[PDB]
Ligand SMILES: N#Cc1cc2c(Oc3ccccc3OCCC(=O)N3CCOCC3)cccn2c1
């Protein structure tokens with residue numbers, strides 16, 4: 001089943017030569033080898049060579065009937081690079097429904113394409129009983145070789161170029177050694193077009209499934225189940241273990257991600273927090289309380305199976321984002337109210353302090369990208385956030401951002417702004433001057449304030465850093481204050497954290513400062529140069 | 545026709561392997577129309593899997609039209625060849641173009657399609673039209689003719705350019721002409737309408753020698769813009785931001801410092817405070833020190849140009865071009881006039897800024913963009929109306945500087 005296709009020229013990486021890795025004695029294997037060698041020579045796929053000082057690459061033999069294997073590792077290191085075959089995969093949520101869909105698989109797919117002539121010498125393998133060294137040399141794409149997946153895909157593509165213009169009403173997808181064909185014409189017309197193509201391929205050299213088209217749905221494809229009108233993930237088994245290892249928690253959070261695309265509501269936040277001890281691979285990591293709960297809620301979701309629908313270009317694309325908590329959000333993309341196209345989650349915090357609108361802006365983003373890769377368009381967004389909420393956020397956000405057309409949906413928890421600082425100081429409300437410090441050496445510190453009304457405080461702080469104190473200093477001035485406070489700090493650091501207005505943070509102190517800020521009713525933070533004697537600050541800097 | 549100028553790569557350097565950005569379906573279909581015509585005109589050819597290079601392709605709109613254009617991000621292939629093709633064939637920068645009272649910019653990149661591109665170099669121009677949902681690996685082309693956007697394309701055509709300009713250049717000894725990439729920058733001191741005729745002259749001259757061409761500037765208004773101290777009829781908080789900005793400014797312009805005194809002791813914030821002689825004296829002394837620029841600030845042609853932008857609210861943005869922190873070559877503001885998406889404003893801002901850079905120094909800057917990386921890598925192709933693309937990256941952390949500018 002060799003082919004008349006044009007070969008693709010192949011070069012070695014410049015200034016490299018072809019491999020020379022001598023082999024070494026397997027009487028039963030050495031025999032099996034001879035059997036495959038001639039039975040493959042008869043098909044022209046390899047040819048004997050007269051040792052004219054050519055190269056060499058190893059070769060082995062293993063029973064599954066026997067089978068032949070070649071170690072091309074030293075040759076792939078020397079041949080040029082090719083175009084990347086398929087870095088990604090078609091997501092089923094983006095396929096278009098077809099009445100009938102036929103799955104064909106081409107056997108000997110690599111052995112049915114010719115390999116370039118000037119590049120044939122570098123494939124010389126040899127099969128101590130003073131072995132006569134029956135020197136061979138490939139003539140088709142050798143299996144394992146660096147250039148086979150790319151070249152075969154190109155040959156296959158050209159071999160198909162006549163047929164796809166003759167029958168433009170059918171659709172073929174290429175994927176490695178498979179062809180997936182799907183038409184909307186009659187199931188009798190289908191079996192016919194299939195039979196045409198199989199015979200066309202075979203006029204080039206490509207054998208195809210005999211028993212009809214063979215594969216009958218549902219299709220087990222790349223960890224999916226493709227049903228003639230439904231798609232869903234292949235089934236998932238979350239282990240039950242007394243101890244958990246890094247290998248086990250990554251395999252778990254792989255499986256949980258794999259399921260997030262169609263099982264709504266998955267969470268993997270507190271599970272992957274465990275992986276920050278990524279130091280080893282077999283190191284036991286004790287689960288946490290939030291983790292063991294999370295994995296329990298994930299079990300509850302999977303117990304009943306849910307499925308996905310296919311794409312219909314004539315129907316609009318829609319996206320809904322709902323808040324889960326602890327910096328976790330789920331989305332669903334659908335055309336129809338009950339039929340999901342797919343789902344997924346967004347939890348990344350992009351730092352240690354984030355707010356709800358920002359995390360929702362980031363989420364929309366992840367969806368826009370995903371929508372564009374998958375369906376080639378961007379969806380209409382349905383968003384639990386008022387217009388009044390978002391407008392005021394991005395008008396005052398220091399970053400630029402692009403907020404697509406969206407429709408408000410009231411289905412709580414709506415996203416909100418739990419507090420706004422003032423932009424201007426509060427009249428006649430108390431103005432605390434704050435500062436704090438901590439001898440890094442002593443790792444000890446103090447947080448104090450000094451107000452206009454004459455109040456002064458200093459609290460001792462143990463096991464702190466100069467940064468962590470100047471946030472306690474703000475904390476203090478909040479918890480010792482009326483509902484309208486003007487706080488004033490020298491700390492560029494703590495000013496920065498606050499002015500972003502985080503509603504959620506992974507600092508205990510900063511969550512406490514958030515809570516107080518919610519309770520207050522007019523806070524206004526202002527900033528003045530540190531150790532610049534601005535008056536008052538010199539006081540909070542004398543104490544502390 | 546012409547002989548393929550021998551193009552080489554800066555030695556020990558391999559070609560670009562940039563990944564293609566995924567595209568909307570509108571944009572793909574436009575790149576598939578466009579390349580189907582460019583393949584009929586033989587300008588680009590389909591290519592095999594033995595070509596591993598790729599550079600990205602985008603789809604933008606020309607000036608305002610319903611015409612889809614194509615844009616190619618030769619930024620990697622540029623850094624790898626042209627840094628050697630800008631010495632072996634470099635086009636020098638006129639350093640007076642910034643002086644001329646008017647500048648107009650002309651799109652001459654239709655010229656390059658006449659010249660064949662070196663046979664052995666074509667492989668490095670590969671691009672890929674992506675499919676939707678990885679349905680197919682893309683359609684793969686390489687260029688057969690000088691590709692616009694590559695920086696060796698104006699360099700090769702340099703000879704033919706000066707020929708076509710030599711009549712017009714000699715009849716007008718007072719007109720500056722700079723070709724950066726696929727653009728002519730024509731500067732003069734005429735009043736506008738005559739500057740416009742002398743343009744249409746040059747337009748019509750170039751058009752009748754075979755070069756077809758489809759932005760009025762004024763670089764004598766541009767100045768490093770100084771620091772405004774507010775004019776208020778003053779609370780304790782106002783004197784704070786006053787001490788705060790003044791302290792930051794004192795880090796660059798030596799001079800201007802006692803004001804604090806007028807706030808000695810733990811005042812309340814909203815306590816309206818009077819104005820002291822020595823304080824007003826300071827304030828006046830500071831205000832003059834500001835108006836007066838500084839010294840030490842010299843362009844270094846070895847050093848990259850770094851541009852920072854801050855969003856200032858209500859459509860105002862501000863920028864600083866520099867190469868050494870606090871040593872600021874150019875400084876400016878920006879504000880469009882409606883349907884002004886925050887990102888459109890940044891796109892227009894960035895495009896404006898790089899032109900000022902092309903005009904002054906003849907190199908584009910690298911941008912520190914106040915925007916999320918993936919948000920930019922999505923809606924940048926929308927308002928982009930330029931043949932070139934600056935380098936960029938994404939900053940996340942401006943503390944107080946929004947006020948300070
Ligand atoms: N095994 C396997 C396999 C099958 C497919 C596959 O089917 C199609 C082929 C051509 C055109 C439309 C095709 O789907 C259209 C959608 C559709 O109605 N479906 C019904 C069940 O079958 C799978 C999908 C596409 C991609 C990868 N595939 C992998």
Ligand SMILES: [Mg+2]
Pocket residue numbers: 435436490530531541
């Ligand atoms: Mg201090």
